[PDB]
Amino acid sequence: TYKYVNKKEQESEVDMKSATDNAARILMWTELIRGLGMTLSYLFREPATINYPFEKGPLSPRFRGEHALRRYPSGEERCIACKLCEAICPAQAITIEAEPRADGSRRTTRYDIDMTKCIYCGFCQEACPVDAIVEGPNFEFSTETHEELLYNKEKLLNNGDKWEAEIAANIQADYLYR
Amino acid sequence: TSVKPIFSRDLNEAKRRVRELYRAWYREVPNTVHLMQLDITVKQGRDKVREMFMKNAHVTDPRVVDLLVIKGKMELQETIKVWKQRTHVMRFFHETETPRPKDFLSKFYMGHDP
Amino acid sequence: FAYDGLKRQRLTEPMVRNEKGLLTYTSWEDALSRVAGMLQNFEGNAVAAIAGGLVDAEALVALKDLLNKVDSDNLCTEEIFPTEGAGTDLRSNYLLNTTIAGVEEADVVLLVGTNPRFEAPLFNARIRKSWLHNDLKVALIGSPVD
Amino acid sequence: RAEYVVTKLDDLINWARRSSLWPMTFGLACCAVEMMHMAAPRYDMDRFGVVFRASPRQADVMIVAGTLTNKMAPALRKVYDQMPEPRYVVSMGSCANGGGYYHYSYSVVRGCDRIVPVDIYVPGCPPTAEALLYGILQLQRKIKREQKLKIWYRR
Amino acid sequence: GVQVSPSGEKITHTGQVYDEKDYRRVRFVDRQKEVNENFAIDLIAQQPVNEVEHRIIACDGGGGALGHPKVYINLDKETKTGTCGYCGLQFKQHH
Amino acid sequence: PTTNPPTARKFIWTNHKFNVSATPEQYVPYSTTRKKIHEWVPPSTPY
Amino acid sequence: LHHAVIPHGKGGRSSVSGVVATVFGATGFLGRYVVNHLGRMGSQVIIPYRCDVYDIMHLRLMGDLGQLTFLEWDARDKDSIRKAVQHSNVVINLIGREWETRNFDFEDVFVNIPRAIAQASKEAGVERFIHVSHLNASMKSSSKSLRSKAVGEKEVRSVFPEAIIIRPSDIFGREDRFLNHFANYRWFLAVPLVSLGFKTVKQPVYVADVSKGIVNATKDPDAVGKTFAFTGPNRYLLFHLVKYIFGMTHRTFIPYPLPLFVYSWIGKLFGLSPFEPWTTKDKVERIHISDVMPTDLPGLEDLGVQPTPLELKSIEVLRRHRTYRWLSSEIEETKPAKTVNY
Amino acid sequence: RPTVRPRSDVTHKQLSAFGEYVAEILPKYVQQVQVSCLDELEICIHPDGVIPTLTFLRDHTNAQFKSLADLTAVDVPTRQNRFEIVYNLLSLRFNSRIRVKTYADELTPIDSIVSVHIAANWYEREVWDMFGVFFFNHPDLRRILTDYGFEGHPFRKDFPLTGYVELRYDDEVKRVVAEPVELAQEFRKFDLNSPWEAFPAYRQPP
Numbered sequence A: 001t002y003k004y005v006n007k008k009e010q011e012s013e014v015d016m017k018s019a020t021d022n023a024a025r026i027l028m029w030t031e032l033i034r035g036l037g038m039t040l041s042y043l044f045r046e047p048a049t050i051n052y053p054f055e056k057g058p059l060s061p062r063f064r065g066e067h068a069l070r071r072y073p074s075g076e077e078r079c080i081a082c083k084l085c086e087a088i089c090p091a092q093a094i095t096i097e098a099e100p101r102a103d104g105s106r107r108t109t110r111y112d113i114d115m116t117k118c119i120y121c122g123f124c125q126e127a128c129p130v131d132a133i134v135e136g137p138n139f140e141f142s143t144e145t146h147e148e149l150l151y152n153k154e155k156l157l158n159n160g161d162k163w164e165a166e167i168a169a170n171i172q173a174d175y176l177y178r
Numbered sequence B: 001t002s003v004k005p006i007f008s009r010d011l012n013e014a015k016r017r018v019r020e021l022y023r024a025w026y027r028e029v030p031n032t033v034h035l036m037q038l039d040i041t042v043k044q045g046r047d048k049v050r051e052m053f054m055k056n057a058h059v060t061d062p063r064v065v066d067l068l069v070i071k072g073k074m075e076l077q078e079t080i081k082v083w084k085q086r087t088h089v090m091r092f093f094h095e096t097e098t099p100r101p102k103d104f105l106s107k108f109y110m111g112h113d114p
Numbered sequence C: 001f002a003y004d005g006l007k008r009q010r011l012t013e014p015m016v017r018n019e020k021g022l023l024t025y026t027s028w029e030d031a032l033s034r035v036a037g038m039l040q041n042f043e044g045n046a047v048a049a050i051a052g053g054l055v056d057a058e059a060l061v062a063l064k065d066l067l068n069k070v071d072s073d074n075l076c077t078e079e080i081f082p083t084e085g086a087g088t089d090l091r092s093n094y095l096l097n098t099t100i101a102g103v104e105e106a107d108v109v110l111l112v113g114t115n116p117r118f119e120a121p122l123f124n125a126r127i128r129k130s131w132l133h134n135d136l137k138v139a140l141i142g143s144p145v146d
Numbered sequence D: 001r002a003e004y005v006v007t008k009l010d011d012l013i014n015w016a017r018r019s020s021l022w023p024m025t026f027g028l029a030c031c032a033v034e035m036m037h038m039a040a041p042r043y044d045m046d047r048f049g050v051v052f053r054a055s056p057r058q059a060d061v062m063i064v065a066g067t068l069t070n071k072m073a074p075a076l077r078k079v080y081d082q083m084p085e086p087r088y089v090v091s092m093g094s095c096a097n098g099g100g101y102y103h104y105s106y107s108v109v110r111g112c113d114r115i116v117p118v119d120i121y122v123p124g125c126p127p128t129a130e131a132l133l134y135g136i137l138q139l140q141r142k143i144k145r146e147q148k149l150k151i152w153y154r155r
Numbered sequence E: 001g002v003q004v005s006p007s008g009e010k011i012t013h014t015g016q017v018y019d020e021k022d023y024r025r026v027r028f029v030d031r032q033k034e035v036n037e038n039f040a041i042d043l044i045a046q047q048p049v050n051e052v053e054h055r056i057i058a059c060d061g062g063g064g065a066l067g068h069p070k071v072y073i074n075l076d077k078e079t080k081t082g083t084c085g086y087c088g089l090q091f092k093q094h095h
Numbered sequence F: 001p002t003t004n005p006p007t008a009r010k011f012i013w014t015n016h017k018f019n020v021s022a023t024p025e026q027y028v029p030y031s032t033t034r035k036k037i038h039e040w041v042p043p044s045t046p047y
Numbered sequence G: 001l002h003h004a005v006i007p008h009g010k011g012g013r014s015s016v017s018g019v020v021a022t023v024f025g026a027t028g029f030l031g032r033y034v035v036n037h038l039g040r041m042g043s044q045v046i047i048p049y050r051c052d053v054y055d056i057m058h059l060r061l062m063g064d065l066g067q068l069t070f071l072e073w074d075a076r077d078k079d080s081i082r083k084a085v086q087h088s089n090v091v092i093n094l095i096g097r098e099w100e101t102r103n104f105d106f107e108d109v110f111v112n113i114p115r116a117i118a119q120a121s122k123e124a125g126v127e128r129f130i131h132v133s134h135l136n137a138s139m140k141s142s143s144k145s146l147r148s149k150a151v152g153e154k155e156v157r158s159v160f161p162e163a164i165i166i167r168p169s170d171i172f173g174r175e176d177r178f179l180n181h182f183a184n185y186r187w188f189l190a191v192p193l194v195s196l197g198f199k200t201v202k203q204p205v206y207v208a209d210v211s212k213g214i215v216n217a218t219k220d221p222d223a224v225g226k227t228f229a230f231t232g233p234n235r236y237l238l239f240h241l242v243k244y245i246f247g248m249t250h251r252t253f254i255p256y257p258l259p260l261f262v263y264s265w266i267g268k269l270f271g272l273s274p275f276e277p278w279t280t281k282d283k284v285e286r287i288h289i290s291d292v293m294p295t296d297l298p299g300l301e302d303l304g305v306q307p308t309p310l311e312l313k314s315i316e317v318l319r320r321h322r323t324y325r326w327l328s329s330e331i332e333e334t335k336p337a338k339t340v341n342y
Numbered sequence H: 001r002p003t004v005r006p007r008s009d010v011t012h013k014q015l016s017a018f019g020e021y022v023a024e025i026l027p028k029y030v031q032q033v034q035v036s037c038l039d040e041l042e043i044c045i046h047p048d049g050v051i052p053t054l055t056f057l058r059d060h061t062n063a064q065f066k067s068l069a070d071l072t073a074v075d076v077p078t079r080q081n082r083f084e085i086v087y088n089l090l091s092l093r094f095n096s097r098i099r100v101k102t103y104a105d106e107l108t109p110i111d112s113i114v115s116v117h118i119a120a121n122w123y124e125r126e127v128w129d130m131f132g133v134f135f136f137n138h139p140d141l142r143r144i145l146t147d148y149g150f151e152g153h154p155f156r157k158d159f160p161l162t163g164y165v166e167l168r169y170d171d172e173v174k175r176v177v178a179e180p181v182e183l184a185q186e187f188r189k190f191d192l193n194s195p196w197e198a199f200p201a202y203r204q205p206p
Ligand SMILES: CCCCCCCCCCCCCCCCCC(=O)OC[C@H](COP(=O)(O)OCCN)OC(=O)CCCCCCCCCCCCCCCCC
Pocket: A026, A027, A028, A029, A032
């Protein structure tokens, strides 16, 4: 199936009624007036703009933004230093050098994202078998400097010690889809 | 060893092809300094042309000299035209990186570089 | 499990003795200058070296050729080996002249009063491999060890 | 009094520079698509006095969207060195901040900051058009808190 | 358990405090040091021991899909307690 | 969050901070690593 | 030294040099090159600014991601010098404006800034206090700055001994105050230079020669007190030094000689400018005190640099001052100056 | 079978039949026509015979392949002629694609098909820029994608992932100039390559 878009030319011996119809399109250029009334149809509409800091537009629970390290309901940093979250991070952004915690437990001494890296792809929150690293719904965390985007572990736990009321609602809204 | 040549035969025919190229830079260094504003006088601009030809003299294979000419015709087509910049042509000089000491003794007052 | 050792009590900077008598930290420009001063000064037979343990077969030469250019042979090592007859000569008096694989192709082993188990532990394993498989008999000479 | 007059002049001098700042018709990558959605009828620049003028001489801020390659880099500082010098800079993306993808490639500069100095950094691979908008509202107060006549009086 | 070093900086989960003779303490000048006050070494210790009835039992983190792949412990030791490597939750056998 | 409020977990913050941009009370990176090497201890005993 | 002041790194731009340094006057002309020659090789460079955050943007580059950290201060307080030089191995002094401000005079700037620093720097425990006086400033000079820039050269030695003191000549470079001074005399009828230029022998020096000299002075085991003098070759004469400029800058050149009876008073007319003045009482007189012969001092060549002649790097600093129809003129052209040995 | 992409046996005979056709019509410069499980055809040739089997495939009633799609150059540095140079073509008339690949050294060029397929004016230039395979009889060979002073042929596997130079602005000379490469993270080559063939009897017997 194919459809011609510009193919109508056939000289039908244009009658004098179909001439003025064409000779008044020209000499009154009215096809354009059908455009001026078309833009006049929109100043009388409601402009879709929104007062940003007072009206921040709509998102969804899977909007992935600023990373954060979640935490079990009884402290206990939810990371267990697997290293299958830098083995997949394609931007090569994460370095999670670890040790035994001196409790005998197994936790990070090091964790890192270079947020000037971190394509914000979601591979690390879907790979984490424990739901430690997530990618929160922040999108206002711009910075005046380059060093404030090198979130190591203390800027990134306490970040997860901030949005956990707001993360878990979205994680609870989505653990059926994943 | 019964290999296929390109743009030449035994080396003596592939050095006029090199001199025809030196025959194009030496007349077009004074042109570039005029066109695009450069600090160079003319002589440290031309001496660099010889410096970058008196780097690959150790070659003894026609096909290789047939090939290095071509890349020079690129970078002359890119310089007789202003597709390059002050930046790109004043990149040959290596003015920034400090020339590391060739001598043994100072070469490991910094770095494990054999 | 000794890789913990390469990150502990390990020398980093070139130190040098102080006007008080303590060790300070300085640069290669200052230490080699002091060492070289005490090598252009004393020469020949009062200038010597004691290697030992964990040493290349490359620094042994450079440390040999350096001290031979000030005509010294006092190049010594920590653990004694004889010299009374053909000590350093004739490379059959300080080697496994048999292959270490050769322990398989053998019916007898006299072990002088040493532990292959704890001196070169894995020369004892070929002995155990050749203790089990091919019927070998051993005679250890001195110091009963388990 | 003189200081109080100068603080208010320096608070009044900036109201113009921060309200009517005219960014520059940059591009280079996906990130630039979100600037269009910040010119769109949802998050309007023009409501913030922010207007695309496609020449630096008419400009007041560079918005660097996209991978700043090594071939584009002379054309990026040939352009930053064509404005007047109340000039500001904004680095949209993780390709422009550090080179997020392509940090280890050979034809990519590992940050807009290698070349032009920057006032603010907007992260996000495609930062939401409401995330440059948070930045060029933050750049819009980063020079509300500049004191250019105060430090002339005490000098 | 953020406890200050004799220099003045704070200690993290891990002792990492820059020494007094270190040059990389400038970066906190006119600034400060983001350090989490809630050490998981202690909060997990501030948590009782589930004195369960069975010898082999299960741990999760409150939701099978919401964390902690389901591993099982052997509670034969009465002296020590059995723990999951994922959380730090302790258990006992009661008999 | 008046009729569907969240669950509190005795670590979550109570006093939320805005984007600390260029003031103090901002972020500065570390090397949270425990220094991974140990050099030597010269004695205070000459010979 | 410690474990991270170690220079374990090749070259620079991501390496270490153990040159954690304070450089106070890094908002102007010389310090922007010093930071460049420290940051390029890999070095933390503490840059205290008293000024606009907008004027320190060009210092945000020439820094490899953590080695450039800034902080605020003012000369008229304590506890803002005892924070910069705390975590340092090196300190560098580049302060000095060119004139008297309403609040900081020649003595408040060339004597009391190094004194407070160098004392506040000796207490911290740093090893080096590279200081920059100005050559021709012994004492009893015709000016008022150089009569005070030797006072600082003594009030530092009496405070922080074993300090390096560089005494450079009159410096030139892009956005300088030396060649771009005489270049802008063309806005008037002509150049009013004294005695038809003669009786003023000058050997200027390029910035990077000074900066590469400083950066290598903060690393040698030498220079534990050695004074210096960064002067450069080609000891020019002023009339021919300016004729070179206005042949390079092809506008025109005619003298208009004067005594100091008036040419030091015209500076007092332009000295009545609340902004950066075009001339002063004393900016006229440095040009005319400028007379020296090198006697014994170490200099550049025994510090790491082979200095640069003005014959070569003069395009870059005067190519702007030209008109179209001279905007490309090839220093092949333009008749190099006459150099005097004496 | 519900997850295994049915083989569709019909269009594997159509192409293999056309494979013998292209070989016996043209024994010169042709070796091992092959056709994969994926129903697509491969006709490897000697590099002296490129144009005689691109004009043929552009100008022939039963092999109308007048539209070029790609011209790659695969690097395999375990053979003399490392640069395999792959053409792939398309019949509007037959709705069939094909692959016509060749070989080359670091110095054994291949004549250009710009007369046959003008589309390869730039696909050849990038192969020169990326790999360094010269092309006889080509209007304006030169770079497209790399810088104007980029010494190197980057897609050569000999070339490092981050190159030898990187650029930055030098206030002392007021230009974006190069000093050699100096990383901050050192790209961590991971050893993700398992044992365990995964494809037995689809392997290399010694
Ligand atoms: C009784 C006996 C005596 C009577 C004697 C009098 C006899 C009658 C005279 C009739 C005159 C008819 C009107 C004359 C003007 C017509 C001009 C004209 O013909 O324009 C034609 C031109 C198109 O030309 P062309 O190149 O051929 O394009 C078609 C190609 N397919 O068209 C164009 O290209 C113009 C397009 C420009 C559009 C710009 C938009 C204009 C915005 C409109 C403002 C609206 C308000 C109007 C205000 C008016 C001023 C008060």
